[PDB]
Symmetry: C3
Subunit: 240 residues, 3 copies
Amino acid sequence: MIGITQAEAVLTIELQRPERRNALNSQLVEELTQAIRKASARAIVLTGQGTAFCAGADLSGDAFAADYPDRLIELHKAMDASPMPVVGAINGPAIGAGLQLAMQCDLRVVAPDAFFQFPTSKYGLALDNWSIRRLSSLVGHGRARAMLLSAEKLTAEIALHTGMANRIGTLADAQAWAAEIARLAPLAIQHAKRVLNDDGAIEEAWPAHKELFDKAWGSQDVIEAQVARMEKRPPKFQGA
Amino acid sequence: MIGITQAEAVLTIELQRPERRNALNSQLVEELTQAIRKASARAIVLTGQGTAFCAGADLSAFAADYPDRLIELHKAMDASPMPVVGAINGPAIGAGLQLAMQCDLRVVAPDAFFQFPTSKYGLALDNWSIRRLSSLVGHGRARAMLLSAEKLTAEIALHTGMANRIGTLADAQAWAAEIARLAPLAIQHAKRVLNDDGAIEEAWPAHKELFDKAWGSQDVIEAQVARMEKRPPKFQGA
Amino acid sequence: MIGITQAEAVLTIELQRPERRNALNSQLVEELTQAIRKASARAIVLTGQGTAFCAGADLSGDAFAADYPDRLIELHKAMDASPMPVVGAINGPAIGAGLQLAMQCDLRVVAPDAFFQFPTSKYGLALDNWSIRRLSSLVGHGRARAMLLSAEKLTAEIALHTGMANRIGTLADAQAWAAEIARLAPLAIQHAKRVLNDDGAIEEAWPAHKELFDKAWGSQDVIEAQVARMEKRPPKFQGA
């Protein structure tokens, strides 16, 4: 579920599953999508309740789990296509699908204890190409290689230094900047936004990327990472 | 009007409309183009007289012939075998930021700043400005500059690489002179390949549609009507 | 010649031509290639012996000098295609073909006194497009322009700032990181490695680029830079 409020010209959308650190499921993703699609508001802020912005994807207990990839695509499609600038107030950690969500925001205001991570190398998973391209664009290639190949965490401070974070601050700060942004010329925002999103980050997986992507997600190592967690021991990966 | 000096193997070109903060008009732009084309010297220094590097476009002369004049100045710098060191002595706003970015290198005064205020005036940029800006300040800051008129300070410019050094015109001339001693053909190949990174890109159909909408919009008028009624704009997104 | 040793699941490969600062020739490159291909182990650490990481290319007394290019291409093809992450332990200067090699590493751990440089503009030479593209990705376009048009050296501290260096540290630091990485999920590393390397840096030179490349390499200025070094005086270039 989600909190929706508007003040003056700023619509604030709050992920409200603080129990599961705002991990995405099918329902949360459908509700966010719907909320982005409306549109009097001239700016959106996306933030999370509790200690996390969004800690990932948690499809356990989600009964419509096979729908999820599709909903996620809808959500990102709606965010990319919205004529509104979306200011992510990243109030704590953005990990996995959460970092992916944070990167789809147009601007970012980040809390000092937040961090960004793609822990795929700890779980044997693979990302879509956009996630990798937009990350490279926001932290620089070199830090992207470390985050992707070694599960390196990007802190708020380094986020600020690279431009992943436009500002360090709180939800109040994000809302104050969104109000100012709410007073600028929409067509100007809308044109820049479209051009920027069409920088080439939106890219179909090449044949080798797809083959490796499927090998990773279909791999036994994926199971071993979860079992290792459950057995309170280190994983023994096999590369299969 | 512009000023042209040459010391050793370094041609300095000074924008000389300090009265208008070196804002571009058709005359300035065509003199610039010609100075760049006719440039004995092995390095160029491009700078502004007074407090500004270049505060934007003017138009207030041979105006309808300006856009094509500005395209050709950029064409001439892109095609120049000379490295152009931008000595960005003060603010570089709008077309002035475009011009700063077409320089090959930049030495930036401590109190200079960079800005595309299009969002305050209802305007839209060519794709090249967006792409080169993103390459120089990084995608993140580029979103902030274009979507919210954020000013890039000198310091943050040195941090991202928009500024290669912070310094004076003298600093830029001294570096132009080191660069004037280097192998011209190596400089030429690297400049060519660096400019063909993809920044020089034809607007997509959707980009051109939004560009034309923005420039033909009623909001463009409203922003000026506000600087007259001495009040804040009420944009309609149309 | 090269040195190869292994501990945990980390294969450290050492360039051992300190007498010429690990500058490349046909033999060192063939040997690095074979050690890369043959690499049980799940991480590689690439480093140099003595003061330099790799100062450039030196085909003085190289029996098989004319095979060098085809071999250099193969070395790069082999690092690019290796399922293993290579950590560059950049123990000192990486210059020319040395910087090219450092960049083909997957991650970089850099000694406080190392620096990176393409002195092409001091020797009248031209780079392949990949070198220019990956350089821009790692230090940012602005600093690339400076490094390529003015031979500017990138210090260790500024490499850390931009992401060319993921860390500042020693061989032993690089080895400890590599061993953490060697415990991560290989199909995740492999996937992300391939996508990253496929960011567009592997680019065929444009016809004008080829033409300027040949012109610089076939120039008298190239001879002049060599005659002037031998003679210990500043070169007088003519742009021909």
